[PDB]
């Protein structure tokens, strides 16, 4: 293994190279080498770092001095050190004989020069210096030719990669010059890394108290900045003493970012810090990530990599631009590969313990430096000054990790001030230019800010290691799909935005989902009274207050989230923007901006519509009407003809809702998805108002979704005739709702349980609505051991006023068990697959390894569950949802790539597939075809054989691995139902 | 303003630290800014000149003098003396000194008068006189005056010059007293005492040794961290000295850095598992630093040696073997002899002290680090705070609480360290206390002890004491000195039995805390999370209640362990308990950890080291006192109780011989350990051939049923009141509490008929033991929740009584007792209502009520509203005035008993004295009570309040109403005052 000391010393040496403090790295290395025990901790790569850093400052003498230390340690110089030495020799410009002698010494060891250069990664400047040194010597350069980017030879991906002649790739509507200007704006945003957005909430005319509060907030922040600068200087001096002593220090890490940048960033953190508060460890991780991102941006700027990125990006923009024409159309990643932009050396992050130590130091400096009076400076500096941040321990013992809470007075000051400027990170806001193509897992999305492929922080290092272990050829399909999802252009709808802004400014609406303001919140009417003075009653009053304040606290968190989302929507209202997409561990694609994203809320779904415009065509108007009926949720069981007829019947309501959403009949409010229903009525009204519906262009996406996507995968895997009919895989004239059947089975179980002693069924009698059973089914299948999913089922039960909330906790558990039995009964295949997957997972977890599998697309997925070793219950429960999530992601990526060959704009939000109304029919045919192709491959057998290779061939526990082999061998038998029927089924997605 | 005070305190500390160039850096910056020059006060200039005189640098002092000249205010007499002091050091010419005297004479009084007017240090006054001597004008030093004596009739007999005085002399020889003084001096210089823990020490396990080694490494790591943080803060503060801002650097310099580091560690040891308030800790840290600083300053000056010589001369008077020709009071002896006066006795200003304490506390919290020391990982990668701040519900208020982490607590328990560190003030003195010549200086010789133990109202009360004539203070000071002079020895037998029970569980009835402190609760609760949301919350609340109840026992265990630790440390050594005065004036023992007032067990342990023979009546008194401790036959006469003692004598002897394995009759008694000790003293008496020959060290307690009620019944002379409280002579003693219980019972019957069900809850549970505390809360409690909590605690002890309505029952009980008192006694109500109305009106005006006792020591109520508090002053005044009268009566009794030679101390109502002395003490205390009420206290109170508040221009109309209220004093009743002398049941 590798001990922690090497992972701190290596980080310190590399960091000291990036800060031009080589005399200090030399000092520390001298002290370390001098002590025998510390010399053991010193590794060859650290020496290959110190020498390389000296080898850029043009110092050959110190290089040979460190070489005396390398020989003294007994290490043998590797390919890296020889190359650093050759790169240093050229700078001194000594005669070619020395270079030839170095080549002779290299020849004595088992090493070459071209092979050594290929094997060991080097910077472009240093590689050029080495090459120039070799050119000075007698040997010619003799550079081997490059390797043309390979393509995936998987049966699923051979269509997209083999271009042939059937290519109709899409091109962005915006002209090339507009894309370049947008890129320059995004580049400016990335450089400053702070986006200032006007607060959407209406600003009242400032009162005298409000003005005073703003002057207080300005004075305080300035005092906090001076204090932060002083604290940073003191910490830097102490850490420099640690450098001279010979112990690992964070002094270069502090040096990498400018002092003013550190101070301003900490102040920005305080503004972003919610009233609720944030965990200290999370805050430290966030601070370290911000420091690393701003350092990567600064390093790229000083190196000149940014300018090369601009030229390469402009050439890449020519492909996307409609006006510019490229002779051979190719996928965006492939085009970027043809340009050959150089992946940055600094893209890789620091080691995780060092990052934690740095972030904790920044948070500790912030709390100690910032002090404000509880009295808020109303008395003349008589009241004690107390730190703004307060460490809070949930458990008194030092074993529980403490968290951080903002000052109560500071929160009040923030409210009273009502500042209109909102500070956002560059990563947080959506990109103003098309995202950088995902050439590699590590490098993609935001151009200047590194975005790792895995958004999840749990198990991040392991999954990334698997990503690099996997051949790049396999990864490319997922990377191409992610690039395609990023390339889609989004424009904020003006009308929907205006209506939500209206409601948001004053009161809001709960049914619509516009969060209520603090004034609306149920504040307690009176404080403890003389009659209530009894300590029992006072304690009860404090508990009710704790509940009321908890509800108010949640409402503030929801309104603040809505405020940020609508402020970004207003900011990006007139400007076309691109949402980059990132992959979780399960492989589901999630948009990188947290604050503004379509998945997060229904209102966000309504706001977002495609900037690119495609005409409706003959069937587009009908698809819009069918979409409108789907959003209401009326006649879901009824076929698409009945839905269209209902749309014609309710057309008068549709038009009236479009003309007046607020003062109208408000039929859209009655619909299950109100804002999306309103947007669809404001597109159908525009279509009918236009003389030709086919001529009219529908920006708004149309969403097609299976009732449960996991159930359809399970049904496909087992080929169950009953299962296919239930989830609509089998063609039918009338679609069958899979949730209704689960509800009926839960109802018969409820009747049986009512006869039994248990009263939970009696409590739930008449309240087991179909929507609750749908959320429960999704929680059971997609969600694994989730407190939030169970809280969501509980939330659905709470929404029903008639249902008593005294037994909501056990009613939710009962619903989870009854659904888990219902599905297992109705679906013969699903239970067998789930049981086999769980049994295999538990056996792998017990042996001490985490379950690892490769998706049919090719990207490896590893469960990140860690018992403080794999967690037996979590891994065994986690494997069926994660496997079916990986299958759903693979099907979505296949659908996306094939729809990109035909030119359709495709994005995926949860189960729903979003595309233009004209494109819907083609997208439906493509997704049925891809689903059939995905399940045509023997998914279960491939998984069984990969698990056998990964874990069954284990010396440590052969017998348990033998039992695992026996359970893996008994794969479920395919049923009578034909796979090809899925293509013919128009109700597979609807 | 406050800042000027802060800068002045900084200047005084700077002179002692000798950082005068640093003071000159601050002074020039302060003069340069016009506003800062206005902030500078004349005294700041005088200070630095005195320091420059010690240094000898004449030109800086001349610069300060010119700076005074530039300011334009008159040059003060304090500065001229400092200039002369400087001139003396470098051997300057006398003629210039005579010119300096001419400047001193100008705009000032004459050379003698100017010297008298301005206070100076012992070196300073000598230097000023020596500088005066060289000049042609004569020094003309004023003649001294003999110490004044009070002319008040009550204290006239005490101060009478007739040679009837027979002051008691301590049994210990003079040489032994000097050795004890040397031991006390060694304790004072060290300032800390190490005592072996009474609790049994188990053989250390491997885990226990590992925890001890870890604790040692942590405490030395803490000392390194504190020393480095202290140096860094000192450097920053020195940079603030140059910036001219307020700095705490000289304060930190006055105490040695090693001493400060060790003080911080001692405070961590003092902090308990529950935790202590941060502001209180800051005050305690500043007080400890001031005490150590005063000890160091006295040591370096050489005042300590003069104190030793003067105190040995004082010791000769107390010593039996040494003979003094003229008997004098202990204060009077010191006044006649040369008296060392320490200028540094006066404390630092309170806001600066708060700032210094906060700085020390912050340094303590950030410097120290504890990681819990994972034994197997041993990796320092976690937040490491020894102390954690809690919101405690009120976050806007931002009250500061500092509590140690449970990990520390578990480690301290695992190590089971025997050594315990106590402050010198905390432990009882090993030598007789210093005589109370002045209010500010008394009690501990090296550690300053102010008269006012209370921190609330401390400033105002001390100012009133200084305003008060010295002789009136002197009478109370003489009484306090007499109480301190009493010698206490720990009874070995009682302590042994307590230690054995303390080691092994003990007994709740005996008050012994329980070491296990376990409470049935699911230990792991539910291993899977949330078996049921309600049940989880229920168990969490139940575990929280168990944690609180267990913490109660831990605090009681620590208090008892500390008590016995001190009792063991002082078991073989005679010690003296100093006594101070609260705002009311009811004297209190200075040592907090070990005191007789604190617990009954301490009362049992403590017996007089000085020994007086029983005499003919001593055995009878001891038997009577045994009956008093049990509390049986209280109604029955003093002869019947004696007969009962003869009846139960076999049980008495058996219990003394075998307390643990005997009939345990003592445990059944109301005061068990006291009963056991008295049974061992009666057994020792009967074992001896002559009981009169036998010497009884044990005190005998004479206590009135209610001291306050007797005062009330005496002031109004109501016949019914006097008969109930035993002032009227009776053959069968009448108990006031029994009558109150009967009246409460009839009110309970009336309320039971009414809709209110509180009476039904209390039916059959209003026992006299409970009704007694309520009377004490009405008569002595001053809007105190804690006394009402004591009533609730008494209700909880009865298992049958439901605790669901205990709070309402306590409120009902206090109201009914209050409403039983007024109807039972007309005089008590007539006086209480008048006092409650007068205080209310004075509180409305905006002045706190101030009144002078018949002895003459002023008493001021300290209650404040964040101005006087309306709901506090009116309730507070009847008990505070009664407490002042009770204190006056006890002081008069103490002084007259001292004249006779009886050893007298007072613990609450209970008067403690030797068994032979009891009869004489009884007669003396009846005589003093009659004399105290012979003076018209109500009229004197009314006249003094008229002088203090009625002559107010601001609100004359309210003052007129107050004048009318004061004029209507309650009329004297038919009952004769002289009857109290004839009544043998006043105290019993």
PDB file of C-alpha atoms in Angstrom, chain A residues 353-522:
ATOM      1  CA  UNK A 353      -6.573  13.998   2.249  1.00  0.00           C
ATOM      2  CA  UNK A 354      -4.498  17.064   1.268  1.00  0.00           C
ATOM      3  CA  UNK A 355      -7.633  18.714  -0.142  1.00  0.00           C
ATOM      4  CA  UNK A 356      -9.475  18.026   3.130  1.00  0.00           C
ATOM      5  CA  UNK A 357      -6.621  19.528   5.181  1.00  0.00           C
ATOM      6  CA  UNK A 358      -6.447  22.654   2.988  1.00  0.00           C
ATOM      7  CA  UNK A 359     -10.225  23.189   2.994  1.00  0.00           C
ATOM      8  CA  UNK A 360     -10.448  22.703   6.790  1.00  0.00           C
ATOM      9  CA  UNK A 361      -7.636  25.292   7.240  1.00  0.00           C
ATOM     10  CA  UNK A 362      -9.540  27.811   5.030  1.00  0.00           C
ATOM     11  CA  UNK A 363     -12.799  27.215   6.982  1.00  0.00           C
ATOM     12  CA  UNK A 364     -10.934  27.496  10.347  1.00  0.00           C
ATOM     13  CA  UNK A 365      -9.258  30.755   9.164  1.00  0.00           C
ATOM     14  CA  UNK A 366     -12.691  32.082   8.062  1.00  0.00           C
ATOM     15  CA  UNK A 367     -14.346  31.383  11.466  1.00  0.00           C
ATOM     16  CA  UNK A 368     -11.427  32.779  13.556  1.00  0.00           C
ATOM     17  CA  UNK A 369     -10.893  35.910  11.373  1.00  0.00           C
ATOM     18  CA  UNK A 370     -14.567  36.976  11.003  1.00  0.00           C
ATOM     19  CA  UNK A 371     -16.063  38.465  14.227  1.00  0.00           C
ATOM     20  CA  UNK A 372     -19.280  40.564  14.528  1.00  0.00           C
ATOM     21  CA  UNK A 373     -21.238  41.957  17.554  1.00  0.00           C
ATOM     22  CA  UNK A 374     -24.458  40.112  18.487  1.00  0.00           C
ATOM     23  CA  UNK A 375     -25.968  43.584  19.069  1.00  0.00           C
ATOM     24  CA  UNK A 376     -25.171  44.405  15.363  1.00  0.00           C
ATOM     25  CA  UNK A 377     -23.140  47.555  16.329  1.00  0.00           C
ATOM     26  CA  UNK A 378     -26.104  49.547  17.697  1.00  0.00           C
ATOM     27  CA  UNK A 379     -24.226  50.290  20.972  1.00  0.00           C
ATOM     28  CA  UNK A 380     -20.943  52.100  20.449  1.00  0.00           C
ATOM     29  CA  UNK A 381     -18.474  49.152  20.520  1.00  0.00           C
ATOM     30  CA  UNK A 382     -19.423  48.194  24.079  1.00  0.00           C
ATOM     31  CA  UNK A 383     -21.003  44.854  23.180  1.00  0.00           C
ATOM     32  CA  UNK A 384     -18.582  41.877  22.867  1.00  0.00           C
ATOM     33  CA  UNK A 385     -17.428  41.023  19.293  1.00  0.00           C
ATOM     34  CA  UNK A 386     -18.188  37.289  18.650  1.00  0.00           C
ATOM     35  CA  UNK A 387     -17.216  35.102  15.587  1.00  0.00           C
ATOM     36  CA  UNK A 388     -19.852  35.007  12.769  1.00  0.00           C
ATOM     37  CA  UNK A 389     -19.548  31.206  12.334  1.00  0.00           C
ATOM     38  CA  UNK A 390     -20.366  28.863  15.280  1.00  0.00           C
ATOM     39  CA  UNK A 391     -19.126  25.245  15.551  1.00  0.00           C
ATOM     40  CA  UNK A 392     -22.138  23.023  16.483  1.00  0.00           C
ATOM     41  CA  UNK A 393     -21.922  19.387  17.721  1.00  0.00           C
ATOM     42  CA  UNK A 394     -24.993  17.121  17.248  1.00  0.00           C
ATOM     43  CA  UNK A 395     -23.288  14.774  19.768  1.00  0.00           C
ATOM     44  CA  UNK A 396     -21.212  16.268  22.646  1.00  0.00           C
ATOM     45  CA  UNK A 397     -18.450  13.613  22.159  1.00  0.00           C
ATOM     46  CA  UNK A 398     -15.490  14.654  19.900  1.00  0.00           C
ATOM     47  CA  UNK A 399     -16.098  11.472  17.813  1.00  0.00           C
ATOM     48  CA  UNK A 400     -19.152  13.042  16.083  1.00  0.00           C
ATOM     49  CA  UNK A 401     -17.983  15.639  13.472  1.00  0.00           C
ATOM     50  CA  UNK A 402     -18.940  19.263  14.316  1.00  0.00           C
ATOM     51  CA  UNK A 403     -20.773  21.494  11.768  1.00  0.00           C
ATOM     52  CA  UNK A 404     -20.956  25.265  11.180  1.00  0.00           C
ATOM     53  CA  UNK A 405     -23.850  27.664  11.713  1.00  0.00           C
ATOM     54  CA  UNK A 406     -24.110  31.320  10.656  1.00  0.00           C
ATOM     55  CA  UNK A 407     -24.639  34.114  13.150  1.00  0.00           C
ATOM     56  CA  UNK A 408     -28.347  34.742  13.929  1.00  0.00           C
ATOM     57  CA  UNK A 409     -27.828  38.517  13.812  1.00  0.00           C
ATOM     58  CA  UNK A 410     -26.007  38.200  10.461  1.00  0.00           C
ATOM     59  CA  UNK A 411     -28.982  36.323   8.969  1.00  0.00           C
ATOM     60  CA  UNK A 412     -31.307  39.102  10.166  1.00  0.00           C
ATOM     61  CA  UNK A 413     -28.961  41.689   8.648  1.00  0.00           C
ATOM     62  CA  UNK A 414     -29.053  39.844   5.309  1.00  0.00           C
ATOM     63  CA  UNK A 415     -32.858  39.855   5.362  1.00  0.00           C
ATOM     64  CA  UNK A 416     -33.162  43.533   6.381  1.00  0.00           C
ATOM     65  CA  UNK A 417     -30.601  44.644   3.766  1.00  0.00           C
ATOM     66  CA  UNK A 418     -32.487  42.845   0.934  1.00  0.00           C
ATOM     67  CA  UNK A 419     -29.503  43.145  -1.404  1.00  0.00           C
ATOM     68  CA  UNK A 420     -30.420  42.646  -5.088  1.00  0.00           C
ATOM     69  CA  UNK A 421     -27.097  41.115  -6.172  1.00  0.00           C
ATOM     70  CA  UNK A 422     -26.855  37.320  -6.187  1.00  0.00           C
ATOM     71  CA  UNK A 423     -23.420  35.699  -6.458  1.00  0.00           C
ATOM     72  CA  UNK A 424     -23.128  32.496  -8.481  1.00  0.00           C
ATOM     73  CA  UNK A 425     -20.214  30.265  -9.417  1.00  0.00           C
ATOM     74  CA  UNK A 426     -19.310  29.809 -13.093  1.00  0.00           C
ATOM     75  CA  UNK A 427     -19.953  26.070 -12.708  1.00  0.00           C
ATOM     76  CA  UNK A 428     -23.312  26.836 -11.047  1.00  0.00           C
ATOM     77  CA  UNK A 429     -24.640  28.882 -13.995  1.00  0.00           C
ATOM     78  CA  UNK A 430     -25.442  27.280 -17.382  1.00  0.00           C
ATOM     79  CA  UNK A 431     -22.852  27.698 -20.120  1.00  0.00           C
ATOM     80  CA  UNK A 432     -23.319  30.532 -22.605  1.00  0.00           C
ATOM     81  CA  UNK A 433     -21.454  28.573 -25.324  1.00  0.00           C
ATOM     82  CA  UNK A 434     -21.653  24.919 -26.454  1.00  0.00           C
ATOM     83  CA  UNK A 435     -19.807  22.677 -23.989  1.00  0.00           C
ATOM     84  CA  UNK A 436     -16.330  21.358 -24.630  1.00  0.00           C
ATOM     85  CA  UNK A 437     -16.450  17.843 -26.153  1.00  0.00           C
ATOM     86  CA  UNK A 438     -15.841  14.939 -23.765  1.00  0.00           C
ATOM     87  CA  UNK A 439     -12.644  13.607 -25.313  1.00  0.00           C
ATOM     88  CA  UNK A 440     -11.608  12.016 -22.002  1.00  0.00           C
ATOM     89  CA  UNK A 441     -13.524  11.199 -18.796  1.00  0.00           C
ATOM     90  CA  UNK A 442     -11.413  13.580 -16.726  1.00  0.00           C
ATOM     91  CA  UNK A 443     -11.597  16.550 -19.159  1.00  0.00           C
ATOM     92  CA  UNK A 444     -14.892  17.902 -20.504  1.00  0.00           C
ATOM     93  CA  UNK A 445     -17.904  20.221 -20.052  1.00  0.00           C
ATOM     94  CA  UNK A 446     -16.755  23.678 -18.821  1.00  0.00           C
ATOM     95  CA  UNK A 447     -13.746  24.781 -20.860  1.00  0.00           C
ATOM     96  CA  UNK A 448     -11.599  26.292 -18.097  1.00  0.00           C
ATOM     97  CA  UNK A 449     -13.052  24.568 -15.009  1.00  0.00           C
ATOM     98  CA  UNK A 450     -12.295  20.826 -14.690  1.00  0.00           C
ATOM     99  CA  UNK A 451     -15.403  18.662 -14.614  1.00  0.00           C
ATOM    100  CA  UNK A 452     -14.793  15.037 -13.729  1.00  0.00           C
ATOM    101  CA  UNK A 453     -17.031  12.453 -15.362  1.00  0.00           C
ATOM    102  CA  UNK A 454     -18.403  11.317 -11.984  1.00  0.00           C
ATOM    103  CA  UNK A 455     -20.478  13.987 -10.245  1.00  0.00           C
ATOM    104  CA  UNK A 456     -20.773  11.848  -7.082  1.00  0.00           C
ATOM    105  CA  UNK A 457     -18.120  12.437  -4.428  1.00  0.00           C
ATOM    106  CA  UNK A 458     -18.722   9.109  -2.658  1.00  0.00           C
ATOM    107  CA  UNK A 459     -16.475   6.517  -4.278  1.00  0.00           C
ATOM    108  CA  UNK A 460     -15.145   9.126  -6.726  1.00  0.00           C
ATOM    109  CA  UNK A 461     -11.530   7.879  -6.768  1.00  0.00           C
ATOM    110  CA  UNK A 462     -12.415   4.192  -7.258  1.00  0.00           C
ATOM    111  CA  UNK A 463     -14.956   4.759 -10.046  1.00  0.00           C
ATOM    112  CA  UNK A 464     -12.532   7.099 -11.847  1.00  0.00           C
ATOM    113  CA  UNK A 465      -9.834   4.418 -11.540  1.00  0.00           C
ATOM    114  CA  UNK A 466     -12.245   1.962 -13.170  1.00  0.00           C
ATOM    115  CA  UNK A 467     -12.968   4.557 -15.878  1.00  0.00           C
ATOM    116  CA  UNK A 468      -9.281   4.777 -16.744  1.00  0.00           C
ATOM    117  CA  UNK A 469      -8.847   0.989 -16.448  1.00  0.00           C
ATOM    118  CA  UNK A 470     -11.627   0.550 -19.021  1.00  0.00           C
ATOM    119  CA  UNK A 471     -10.496   0.895 -22.672  1.00  0.00           C
ATOM    120  CA  UNK A 472     -11.155   4.407 -24.059  1.00  0.00           C
ATOM    121  CA  UNK A 473     -12.832   2.801 -27.084  1.00  0.00           C
ATOM    122  CA  UNK A 474     -15.722   1.632 -24.869  1.00  0.00           C
ATOM    123  CA  UNK A 475     -16.103   4.984 -23.036  1.00  0.00           C
ATOM    124  CA  UNK A 476     -16.490   6.955 -26.321  1.00  0.00           C
ATOM    125  CA  UNK A 477     -20.172   6.071 -26.814  1.00  0.00           C
ATOM    126  CA  UNK A 478     -21.157   7.474 -23.420  1.00  0.00           C
ATOM    127  CA  UNK A 479     -18.860  10.464 -23.987  1.00  0.00           C
ATOM    128  CA  UNK A 480     -20.443  11.109 -27.402  1.00  0.00           C
ATOM    129  CA  UNK A 481     -23.928  10.898 -25.881  1.00  0.00           C
ATOM    130  CA  UNK A 482     -22.933  13.342 -23.121  1.00  0.00           C
ATOM    131  CA  UNK A 483     -21.507  15.734 -25.724  1.00  0.00           C
ATOM    132  CA  UNK A 484     -24.733  15.486 -27.748  1.00  0.00           C
ATOM    133  CA  UNK A 485     -26.856  16.259 -24.667  1.00  0.00           C
ATOM    134  CA  UNK A 486     -24.641  19.258 -23.909  1.00  0.00           C
ATOM    135  CA  UNK A 487     -24.855  20.542 -27.508  1.00  0.00           C
ATOM    136  CA  UNK A 488     -28.659  20.933 -27.264  1.00  0.00           C
ATOM    137  CA  UNK A 489     -29.627  24.610 -26.981  1.00  0.00           C
ATOM    138  CA  UNK A 490     -32.124  25.886 -24.406  1.00  0.00           C
ATOM    139  CA  UNK A 491     -34.095  29.149 -24.352  1.00  0.00           C
ATOM    140  CA  UNK A 492     -36.231  30.417 -21.453  1.00  0.00           C
ATOM    141  CA  UNK A 493     -39.895  30.884 -22.372  1.00  0.00           C
ATOM    142  CA  UNK A 494     -40.889  34.498 -21.745  1.00  0.00           C
ATOM    143  CA  UNK A 495     -44.619  34.118 -21.012  1.00  0.00           C
ATOM    144  CA  UNK A 496     -44.322  31.308 -18.451  1.00  0.00           C
ATOM    145  CA  UNK A 497     -41.441  33.159 -16.795  1.00  0.00           C
ATOM    146  CA  UNK A 498     -43.523  36.340 -16.528  1.00  0.00           C
ATOM    147  CA  UNK A 499     -46.451  34.494 -14.926  1.00  0.00           C
ATOM    148  CA  UNK A 500     -44.225  32.762 -12.364  1.00  0.00           C
ATOM    149  CA  UNK A 501     -42.455  36.058 -11.629  1.00  0.00           C
ATOM    150  CA  UNK A 502     -45.875  37.673 -11.008  1.00  0.00           C
ATOM    151  CA  UNK A 503     -46.888  34.989  -8.530  1.00  0.00           C
ATOM    152  CA  UNK A 504     -43.401  34.878  -6.939  1.00  0.00           C
ATOM    153  CA  UNK A 505     -43.335  38.631  -6.127  1.00  0.00           C
ATOM    154  CA  UNK A 506     -46.612  38.567  -4.177  1.00  0.00           C
ATOM    155  CA  UNK A 507     -47.753  35.551  -2.084  1.00  0.00           C
ATOM    156  CA  UNK A 508     -47.355  32.795  -4.668  1.00  0.00           C
ATOM    157  CA  UNK A 509     -49.505  29.741  -5.124  1.00  0.00           C
ATOM    158  CA  UNK A 510     -49.104  26.393  -3.326  1.00  0.00           C
ATOM    159  CA  UNK A 511     -50.964  24.174  -5.820  1.00  0.00           C
ATOM    160  CA  UNK A 512     -48.905  25.693  -8.646  1.00  0.00           C
ATOM    161  CA  UNK A 513     -45.762  25.144  -6.559  1.00  0.00           C
ATOM    162  CA  UNK A 514     -44.573  28.769  -6.214  1.00  0.00           C
ATOM    163  CA  UNK A 515     -43.036  28.765  -2.672  1.00  0.00           C
ATOM    164  CA  UNK A 516     -44.738  30.891  -0.017  1.00  0.00           C
ATOM    165  CA  UNK A 517     -42.895  33.864   1.567  1.00  0.00           C
ATOM    166  CA  UNK A 518     -41.818  34.051   5.236  1.00  0.00           C
ATOM    167  CA  UNK A 519     -44.732  36.340   6.158  1.00  0.00           C
ATOM    168  CA  UNK A 520     -47.215  33.724   4.904  1.00  0.00           C
ATOM    169  CA  UNK A 521     -45.550  30.992   7.121  1.00  0.00           C
ATOM    170  CA  UNK A 522     -47.408  29.901  10.298  1.00  0.00           C
TER     171      UNK A 522
END
